[PDB]
Amino acid sequence: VSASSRWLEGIRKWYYNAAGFNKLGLMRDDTIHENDDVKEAIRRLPENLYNDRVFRIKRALDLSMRQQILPKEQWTKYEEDKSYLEPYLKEVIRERKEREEWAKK
Amino acid sequence: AGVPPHPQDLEFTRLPNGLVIASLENYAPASRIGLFIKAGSRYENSNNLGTSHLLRLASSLTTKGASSFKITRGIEAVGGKLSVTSTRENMAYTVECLRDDVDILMEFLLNVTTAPEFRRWEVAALQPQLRIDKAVALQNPQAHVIENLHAAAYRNALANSLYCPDYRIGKVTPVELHDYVQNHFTSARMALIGLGVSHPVLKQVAEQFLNIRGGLGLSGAKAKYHGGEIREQNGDSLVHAALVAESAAIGSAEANAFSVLQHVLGAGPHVKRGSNATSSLYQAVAKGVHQPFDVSAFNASYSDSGLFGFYTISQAASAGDVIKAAYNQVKTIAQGNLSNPDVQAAKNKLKAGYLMSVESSEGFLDEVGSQALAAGSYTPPSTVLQQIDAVADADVINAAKKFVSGRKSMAASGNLGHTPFIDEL
């Protein structure tokens, strides 16, 4: 909407490229630490996203073993990073918080 | 003095969109509500068999106004109940609780029926329940006989099983459940019934939350009687068998003649461990059979068809003898050998049985709910008994004539070495 919230994105694009998981062809949600909430969200993914997530992670563990990265052409662009897991994950948390609010009635 | 108060009258309303509301205020401590829908298994086709069964198991799944967790915990906190009963014609979503908590359970009932989400994973976790639920039901040999009996009798619609075919378990999709509720949970197909609730509340609820259009108009997918037979050779110790012919659709006067004919022949025992002295079929079979058996008239009446006949249980070797003895006893009635005191006695049993079946709230709500869907009206019991009294002895005879001469349907299971086919009767 403005120029101030636009360099805010510029420093988030900066941190994104510095974090460097896009150099392994990975997306932000591929790097989330699996807890009980996350393991449930992954369980709920449709077959296409689950299989894609499996291969991207497998491709990255392969690269990490060789201490290599993908060509710059194949890095995950900050603009094209689909937060595919947070919708499922946010509903998992929402359900858990409901149980927790009932548990103290 | 110890007397009951002025019994209020049932109130009844038809909205222009087709929805029906019926309420009664018995001032009872508990309240019961039911949403009866013309969505039984007859409305499945051969590309989505079993959808109405899985739908019947999915009332506690997640809706738009209530998580799966909230439905279960909300109802249990109040000690209430949520049930789903299914006929080949109707599904009936019933709710029970104390009258102070009707607000809560109505909200749950509406979310189940109006706002199910059918989430891909919840549905997926539920498919194994079909196998368990069907396995429990088929522990009764009667269950598979009746299912096979309808599959042999009809080409479509009423041929469909209440229970999901084995090949469909795991394959019923969330889309099919969505389409099924869209096509069949329509205002024109619904009835909202309530005990211990006032009529203005139900009407308000109905106008605000149960005005759903579209889907499928009351389809003329007429059940086509066919006749046939299905024979299940298994290792049961006894042979169960049923023999029927097309009879009469419910509501018509011919159906009352069939109901009376049922109680002439013998529907069930009235005394514990009795010989059933006034059961025509039992005494007919018992003369030439001195081994354990059972026999009963079978009467099933549907919106556009019906099946009438008898049901037999016997030793595998006495199968045909029991069948043929039962059949000849019906032939006797078709030949006009029927006394008038026997009809007045059958009209006594049927009248007494009907009133007994509506003593409780659960039986009363079911009759009102199914009356509303089948007939679009409510018929008090004094008028029912009048319609029973109007049955003449010749009507009963003609009903037995229609059975003898009509194309038959047979289902039998057991060791069928001595169980006749149709053409051997």
Place this chain on the structure above:
Amino acid sequence: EQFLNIRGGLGLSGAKAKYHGGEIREQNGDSLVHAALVAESAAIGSAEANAFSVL
């Protein structure tokens, strides 16, 4: 003569197969419909069976 001279049991029983007609319908989830339609024809060896083979 030495090892296959077994008597008794059942003589060539006249438990004649009784044709009846009927139909059995198995609703499943195969992609195609398989179907067979037949009528009683002729016992093997008779000349009518050769006509059926030719047909």
Place this chain on the structure above:
Amino acid sequence: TATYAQALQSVPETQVSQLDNGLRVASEQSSQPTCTVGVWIDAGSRYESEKNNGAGYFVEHLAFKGTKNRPGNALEKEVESMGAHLNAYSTREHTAYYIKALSKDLPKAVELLADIVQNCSLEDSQIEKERDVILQELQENDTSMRDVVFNYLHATAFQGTPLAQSVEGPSENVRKLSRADLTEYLSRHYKAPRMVLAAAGGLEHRQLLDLAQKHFSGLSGTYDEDAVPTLSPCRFTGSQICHREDGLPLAHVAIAVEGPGWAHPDNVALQVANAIIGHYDCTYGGGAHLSSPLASIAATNKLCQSFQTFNICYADTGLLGAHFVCDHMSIDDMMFVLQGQWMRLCTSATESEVLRGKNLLRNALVSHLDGTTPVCEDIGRSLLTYGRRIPLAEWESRIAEVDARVVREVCSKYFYDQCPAVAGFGPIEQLPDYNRIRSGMFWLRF
């Protein structure tokens, strides 16, 4: 509209009268065209000796098979022709015969009940018929693992006492019970003060009392020549019985402690506790999300096909506990979770879950007394046990008293550090040893 409290006042009070000979006549009027009337009797296996055990069950087979004024099948014909239904049952303490019929058929129905009790034919040829019938029924019962394991619970828990006996009696007694044994049982136990003529439906209490004075005047007077059955107390024994049978697909377990009795106010609070634990089987819909931890865990981890809590009451005693059905490798886990919930309610019950258990009992009570038959049953039974009808308004008051402190005090009184009775049947190799079971009845942390 009317509230729940206001609806409980709107029930008609059961009108109660007593005849001159001892018989008690009780009715709850409604606006129904149908009704049920029946005779409830203080009789059962607990009153029988080992030498005539099973007699009253023999009588049940013969009650409907003939009488002096209506010999043979004449009694079946009369009730079937007026569309009525006739039934009976026998527990270890109570015996009942009742009819369902039209309200206009009440005077004939009362007449038949009177003729059944007083004037029974008991032809020696009918007895020999009913003898082979009972033996077959015994072979049938042997296949109901549920009915077996509860007869085993009674057998071990009340060993050495009349309550240990089954209702049906042993096969040996059936084969030698004579007509003299049966008439002795009837003449002793079927006396007017120990009977109640209960009715429920559309009927004025005046009418029922008139018929009682007409058709039940011939009963034996108040005195009985000094030979009254006085029920002695029945010793409860902490004990265990295991019937190992690995050929059966599923194991049945029943476990219980001694309960107080019929007229003890503790039963209310105990029923609230049993409702928290609740019941379950594999066809329920809730599964993981059920309130009861036992239910939720059993569905999630698939520890059983079904379980149910119970509070079986008798005079000055009872059986309080649970029963379940599971795979042979799940018995230990089921008993662990079961006992853990008993211990948890003894020591740390919370107010919220007790409100749920209270509401579950409220719902269970109202909906059970729905129809003419269950009201007439509650009339008849309640006068043999409490000596009066307890209105629903009182039951609600005895419930609202219950809070979390009440269930903890009441449960500890009966559950905590008490010797249970155990009964097992089926593939029960994994059934925990009795010392391990006994150690599950307390917590070292408490």
Place this chain on the structure above:
Amino acid sequence: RGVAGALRDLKRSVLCRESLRGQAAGPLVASVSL
């Protein structure tokens, strides 16, 4: 508890003629609960 009615774990066997009355069917119904 699930229900199936139609009259108007090894379960249990039936042998005699008195316990067999009431078994013959007389239209099926399928019910489900919580």
Place this chain on the structure above:
Amino acid sequence: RGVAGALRDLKRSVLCRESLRGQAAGPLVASVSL
């Protein structure tokens, strides 16, 4: 290897009309071996 003939592990699918000829039955036989 066990055999079933009648023409006179996921197996494999048939889609076209050329691979479908030869499938229609033409009396069954059941054979067993070592």
